[PDB]
Amino acid sequence: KFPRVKNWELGSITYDTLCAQSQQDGPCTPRRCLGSLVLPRKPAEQLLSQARDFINQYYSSIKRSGSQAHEERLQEVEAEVASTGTYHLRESELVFGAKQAWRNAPRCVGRIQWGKLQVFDARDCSSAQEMFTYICNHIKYATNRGNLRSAITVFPQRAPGRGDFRIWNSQLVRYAGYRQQDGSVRGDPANVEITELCIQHGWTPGNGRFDVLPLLLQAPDEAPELFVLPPELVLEVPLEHPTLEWFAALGLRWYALPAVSNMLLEIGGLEFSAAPFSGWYMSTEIGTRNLCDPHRYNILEDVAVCMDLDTRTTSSLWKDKAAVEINLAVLHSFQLAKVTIVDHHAATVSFMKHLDNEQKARGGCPADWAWIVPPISGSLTPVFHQEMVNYILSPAFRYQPDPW
Amino acid sequence: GPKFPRVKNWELGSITYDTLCAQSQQDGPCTPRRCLGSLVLPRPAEQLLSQARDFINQYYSSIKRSGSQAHEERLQEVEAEVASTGTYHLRESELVFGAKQAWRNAPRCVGRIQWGKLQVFDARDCSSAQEMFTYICNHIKYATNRGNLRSAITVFPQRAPGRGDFRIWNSQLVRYAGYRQQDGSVRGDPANVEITELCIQHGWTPGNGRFDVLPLLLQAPDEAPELFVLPPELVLEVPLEHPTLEWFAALGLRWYALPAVSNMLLEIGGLEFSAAPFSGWYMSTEIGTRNLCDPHRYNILEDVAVCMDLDTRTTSSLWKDKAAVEINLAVLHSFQLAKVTIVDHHAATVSFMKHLDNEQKARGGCPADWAWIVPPISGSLTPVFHQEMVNYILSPAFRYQPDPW
Ligand code: HEM
Ligand code: HEM
Ligand SMILES: CNCc1cc(C#N)cc(OCc2ccc3c(C)cc(N)nc3c2)c1
Ligand SMILES: CNCc1cc(C#N)cc(OCc2ccc3c(C)cc(N)nc3c2)c1
Ligand SMILES: C[C@H](O)[C@H](O)[C@H]1CNc2nc(N)[nH]c(=O)c2N1
Ligand SMILES: C[C@H](O)[C@H](O)[C@H]1CNc2nc(N)[nH]c(=O)c2N1
Ligand SMILES: [Zn+2]
């Protein structure tokens, strides 16, 4: 029945009863667990039941279940689906749903912040040009001169027999990755494909390691359009180390704003194929994954050599030492520039508080241990020793196929 | 595509499919509705006979005599034996194969590249706690080999119907005492408070150091457990020092050479070996990160960080990460200097990737528990972080079992 959940550092035990509210299967079966897999392998009645469940969630949230307005709204949704095969959300429902989808995201360690989310309604958008304007305003609001504010902008929902609104870029701000003839890559290797799409769609490329990409924005059944972001809108933090002077000379930097733009937002059965959302960075995303992954900037060996570490053997722990200093430079640099950032210790400590809040509030919290535990110093954080239960609740953020 | 889990390595972009999972005869804790993969400890002659037949089939495949007259005769012999006694018995070569297969099958072990090289000591003739002690001492001496460690397992008699189990009460053959103090704190290893108190209840004169080696509490069938002190010359330890931080040696830290787990159950063909201690050599993060830095273990992080003169009043100094790295380095350097076998988390995980490739060819997959395989510091700096894994139960298996008391 209900899973018993133990924290092995504290010996404390909870029971997840929230998982009973899941209506979608994940990838595991009794025969085998597939929890470490990154991506999933792959009528009106279904829509209506999801819509009803969501409207119920909404009215429960404002403490008006069974009220006159609740009953009426359910009738509206019914009548609209029955006549048109679909329906539309009111702005307040949309705001509630967006917050819930963040709240429900099992891979997000940042969910203590979930109720604080600025929601821009961009559902009255009819062109790529219009999308660009909203995106620019989103970035301006969210960046806020370094005092970062979580935000989401929601473009029109998918409709049957019509192409989707899509942002082709995986994030609103990304660095170009240029493939050199000698097989190597200049810039960010994770972005080679989008970089090439941009050029093919008319972009005049740079040739640096940190060239901010233009956006490819797509209105339904139209070819994507290219828009260069005004450089003053894109706040960036040059990286230096608090004690190691040669570090600044590495010419490293990162953008302030993590804004994911290729995920699908699902609310009450309705799907929003373009709904980019941003918060602020946890230092390890930059210092560990983006800069140290072998298939990203891969700077570990460079930094270790500048530290005069013995790269001959793994047993010198040169990689571990370099990684720590790189993460330190990220924290120092962001703090020096007055740009919001949170280290992995403070973040995971906030997440434990969040688990506790959610236990009292809903009787559980879906969480993906492999993603919640940071990529360095895992067991040095409280989340490592916390058992977690992973399941899919809706409203939800989902992966969706690439539009090309 | 193929009707089997598809497994991707995100560093290299390479793809495999796990077909081995189809062989799993036992359910784990997950369902389509919720994944419970992070949970540490998740919850009949014909049942015996089917497990027995499956194992005998595995054995004869492994020697390429599947379908042979000897295969069919051994099957007949196991059925006869279960029919007239309710149980059966493994031949020596079957026991050796089963023990190795149990190790090969262990999803949480990063050290499985070595699975073929395991010295199996058959102790199924043991009939007293005294004799268990002799077997255990011999195991330790062989496995320790003055620092050139050798993987080994010693197998004591199986569970028998209407007869008490052989049990080793201790969780490992070598463990440090944990003494609860009057102020509520613990001196030594807090993990070992209960066993320490049990040893005292059974007549042990306790010490009062941070690193007192515990005596062994050994139990022969239907007998009270008896106490046995390990002769200190048999327990190899390594004092911890740091290659450049000269003060680290003054901390007086140390650890033992031999990780020898003694409270797990070896299951083979439905037979249950309740006492079957097994040993290898350490991966350095087990000592340097978990045993020494866990808040509920020795918890030395702040002490080290203070000696290093770090700012422990704020998380953003990364004092915890810095201290933890130097502690791990001290473990590695000290074991290396002492010429005692040890492997760092980088070399270990790299060897595990080799093991995955070996097993992909040999068996079409490898059961692996991602959360346990990925080391507790520097996770994404190791290749296994970026490797998707499929987790399932295969038998022969090592299993958790309830404590005898
Ligand atoms: C406010 C500060 C925030 C912090 C510190 C934070 C932290 C993180 C981190 C560290 C990850 C793992 C990322 C990775 O390894 O690639 C993550 C994932 C995620 N975050 Fe948050 N986040 C924040 C805000 C938000 C907001 C505002 C939303 C949505 C409204 C959100 C939704 C998500 C989702 C859906 C994922 C999983 C993405 C995936 O499955 O690939 N986060 N977050
Ligand atoms: C030869 C060197 C070996 C290395 C470097 C090694 C490494 C490891 C590590 C790091 C763990 C995780 C332990 C923890 O976090 O508590 C582990 C677990 C495990 N090892 Fe290995 N190991 C070795 C040999 C062996 C041998 C010889 C056996 C059995 C014959 C074995 C069976 C197991 C089992 C069953 C577990 C998981 C136990 C559980 O589920 O709690 N290992 N090993
Ligand atoms: C699984 N492949 C990688 C990946 C794919 C997709 C997709 N499609 C989305 C991904 O989101 C990572 C993410 C998303 C939002 C974040 C926010 C708001 C803040 C923050 N600090 N970090 C964040 C990280 C990651
Ligand atoms: C105590 N933490 C949970 C725990 C419980 C039980 C039980 N019941 C067993 C456990 O085995 C960890 C283990 C086992 C064998 C190892 C070998 C041979 C070598 C090595 N380097 N490390 C090893 C670690 C761990
Ligand atoms: C194979 C594994 O699931 C994959 O590398 C995951 C592991 N954990 C992660 N955790 C976070 N936060 N982000 C990631 O991209 C990943 N990648
Ligand atoms: C909650 C979580 O499952 C638990 O802390 C696990 C995580 N991964 C681990 N991995 C290893 N190797 N050993 C452990 O004890 C643990 N503990
Ligand atoms: Zn699972």
In Å, how far are A142, A233, A315, A359 from A236, measured between CA atoms?
A: 14, 10, 36, 38
Do A108 and A202 belong to one domain? no
B279 lines ligand 4 (CB under 6 A): yes
Taking Cα atoms as reference points, which of B108, B399, B27, B387 lies closest to residue A32?
A: B27
Contact B122, B91 (CB under 8 A): no
Instruction: Please give the residue range of the domain that contains residue A314.
Output: 236-258+281-346
Give one word for B86, left, alpha or beta, with left for phi > 0 and alpha for psi -120 to 50: left
- Residues in chain B with CB shorter than 8 Å from the CB of A320 are 325, 328, 377-378, 381
Q: How many structural domains is chain B composed of? A: 3
Question: Ligand 6: which atom is nearest the Cα of residue B373?
Answer: 12
Cβ(A99)–Cβ(A114) below 8 Å: yes
**CA-nearest residue, atom 43 of ligand 2:** B109
Q: Ligand 6, closest atom to CA B39?
A: 3
Q: State whether A90 and A169 are in the same domain.
A: no
| A32 alpha carbon, closest ligand | 7
Q: Which amino acids of A are annotated catalytic?
A: 108, 111, 280, 285
- B247's tokens: 């003060």
Judge: B390–A34 Cβ closer than 8 Å, yes or no.
Answer: yes
- Contact between chains at A376 and B378 (C-beta distance less than 8 A): yes
Instruction: Report the alpha-carbon distance of residue B66 to residue A78 in Å, rounded.
Output: 63
Mark A327-354 as b/e (b = at least 16 C-beta within 10 Å).
Answer: bbbbbbbbbeeebbbbbbbbbbbebbeb
* Contact status, residue B259 vs residue B343, Cβ threshold 8 Å: no
Angle, to 10 degrees, between the axis of helix A68-84 and the axis of helix A44-61?
160
Gap between the Cα atoms of B256 and B238, Å rounded:
6
> Nearest C-alpha to atom 16 of ligand 3 is from which residue?
A258
Q: Which of B17, B20, B24, B23 is nearest to B3 (CA)?
A: B17
| CATH number of the domain encompassing residue A296 | 3.90.1230.10
Tokens of A341: 């950032």
Q: Which residues of B touch A31 (CB under 8 A)?
A: 21, 24, 27-28, 392
CB burial class (10 A; 0-12, 13-18, 19+) of residue A125? buried
Residue nearest to atom 1 of ligand 2 (CA): B280
Per the document, the length of chain B is: 405
Tell me, yes or no, whether A60 lies in a domain. yes
CB of B286 sitting under 6 A from ligand 4: yes
Nearest beta carbon to residue B376 from set A3, A345, A379: A379
A211: domain CATH number is 3.90.440.10
Nearest by CB: B34 against A346, A349, A389: A389
Q: What is the C-alpha to C-alpha distance for residues A209 and A185, in angstroms, rounded to an integer?
A: 9
Residues A298 and A311 in one domain: yes
Rounded Cα–Cα distance for residues B330 and B254 (Å): 10
Q: Where are the alpha helices (DSSP H) in A201-317?
A: 283-284, 291-292, 300-306
Q: Which of B359, B271, B290 is nearest to B88 (CA)?
A: B271
Show the tokens assigned to A176.
């170009």
Q: Report DSSP state, residue A114.
A: T
DSSP state at residue B287: I
On whether A370 is known to bind a ligand per the annotation, the reply is: yes
Shared-domain flag, residues A184 and A196: yes
Sign, CA dihedral A281-A283-A287-A288, equals: negative
Exposure string for B254-283, b = 16+ CB within 10 A, e = fewer: ebbbbbbbbbbbbbbbbbbbbbbbbbbbbb
How far is Cα A374 from Cα A286, in angstroms, rounded to an integer?
A: 12
User: Phi and psi (nearest 5°) for A13?
Assistant: -130, 135
Residue B128 CB neighbour total at 10 angstroms: 14
Assign A341 to helix, strand or coil: strand
Say whether both B197 and B133 belong to one domain: yes
Q: Determine, yes or no, domain membership for B155.
A: yes
Q: Which of B218, B219, B215 is nearest to B234 (CA)?
A: B215
Strand, helix or coil at B400?
A: coil
Residues A22 and A116 in one domain: yes
d(C-alpha A311, C-alpha A314), whole Å? 7
Is residue B380 assigned to a domain?
A: no
* Co-location of B341 and B312 in the same domain: yes
**Pair B300, B292: CB distance under 8 Å:** yes
Q: Residue B13, Cβ neighbours under 10 Å: how many?
A: 8
H helices of B34-166, in order, are 45-62, 69-85, 92-104, 129-144
Two structure tokens written together for A21 = 């509210």
Asked whether residue A381 is assigned to any structural domain, the reply reads no
Which of A8, A320, A370 is nearest residue B381 as measured by Cβ atoms? A320
Between the CA of residue B373 and those of A33, A36, A378, B112, B325, what are the distances in Å?
15, 11, 12, 11, 19
Those residues whose C-beta lies under 8 Å from the C-beta of residue A261, and which sit 6 or more positions away, are A167, A169, A170, A171, A172, A274, A276
Ramachandran sector of residue A377 (left: φ over 0; alpha: ψ -120 to 50; beta: rest): left
The CB density around residue B313, as the number of other CB atoms within 10 Å, is: 7
Query: How many angstroms away from the CA of A67 is the closest CA of chain B?
Result: 32
Q: Identify whether residues B44 and B155 lie together within a single domain.
A: yes
Q: Cα distance from A222 to chain B (closest Cα, Å)? A: 32
- For atom 43 of ligand 1, the residue with the nearest CA is A108
DSSP string, B26-50: B--S--SS-B-TT-SS---HHHHHH
Phi–psi pair at A284, nearest 5 degrees = -70, -25
Decide if A125 contacts A131 (C-beta within 8 A). yes
Give how far A120 is from chain B: nearest CA, Å: 33
The residue among A289, A311, A317 with the most chain B CBs within 10 A of its CB, best to mutate, is A317
Residues of chain A neighbouring B375 (CB-CB closer than 8 A): 378
**Sign of the dihedral through C-alpha A384, A390, A392, A393:** negative
Task: Assign A94 to helix, strand or coil.
Answer: helix
Say what angle helices B319-337 and A318-336 make with each other, to 10 degrees. 170
Look at residues A37, A35, A27, A32 and name the one whose alpha carbon lies nearest to residue B25. A32
Best residue in B320, B381, B386, B393 to probe A by mutation, most A CBs within 10 Å?
B381
Mark the residues whose beta carbon lies below 5 A from ion ligand 7.
Answer: A 28, 33, 35; B 30, 35, 37
Largest CA distance in chain A: 73
Taking the mean position of all CA atoms in its chain, how far away is CA B98? 16
Nearest CA to ligand 1 atom 21: A108
Decide: B285 and B345 in contact? Cβ < 8 Å. Answer: yes
Residue in chain B nearest A347 by alpha carbon? B315
Report CA dihedral (B5, B9, B15, B16) to the nearest 10 degrees.
-50
Contact B20, B395 (CB under 8 A): no
Q: What is the Rg, in whole angstroms, of the alpha carbon atoms belonging to chain B?
A: 23
E strands, A139-291, are: 151-154, 166-167, 177-179, 185-187, 215-218, 225-227, 236-238, 253-255, 259-260, 264-267, 270-272, 277-278, 281-282
Q: How many other C-beta atoms are found inside a 10 Å radius of the C-beta of residue B249? A: 14
Quote the crossing angle between the two packed helices B69-85 and B45-62, to the nearest 10°.
160
Contact A99, A91 (CB under 8 A): no
- Nearest CB to A29 within list B32, B39, B329: B32
Asked whether residue B59 is domain-assigned, the answer is yes
**Is B155 found in the same domain as B48?**
yes
Determination technique used: X-ray
User: Which residues lie below 8 Å from residue A177, measured CB to CB, with a gap of 6+?
Assistant: A185, A186, A187, A188, A189, A190, A191, A192, A195
Asked if A249 is an interface residue toward chain B (Cβ–Cβ < 8 A), one would say no
In a domain, B324, yes or no: yes
CB atoms within 10 A of CB B108: 15
Beta-carbon contacts below 8 Å between A and B = 205
Structure-token pair, residue A306: 């500048």
Closest of A151, A144, A136 to residue A227, by C-alpha: A136
Report how far apart, in Å, the C-alpha atoms of B254 and of each of B148, B251, B295, B326 are: 18, 9, 18, 15
**H or E, element range at B339:** none
The verdict on residue A11 lying in a domain is no
Neighbours of A66 (CB within 10 A): 9
Answer whether A195's CB lies under 8 Å from A208's CB.
no
In sequence order, what are the residues at sequence separation of 6 or more whose Cβ sits closer than 8 angstroms to the Cβ of residue B367?
Answer: B20, B21, B24, B105, B107, B390, B391, B392, B393, B394
**If we measure between CA atoms, which residue out of A10, A17, A40 comes closest to residue A27?**
A40
Examine the domain organization and report whether B36 and B69 are in the same domain: yes
Ligand 2 centroid – CA A252 distance (Å): 40
**Residues in chain A after which the chain is broken, C→N over 2.5 Å:** 42
CATH of the domain at B78: 3.90.340.10
Residue B249 φ then ψ, to 5°: -60, -30
B23, B145: one domain: no
Q: Is B288 within the bounds of a domain?
A: yes
Verify that B215 and B249 share a domain, yes or no: no
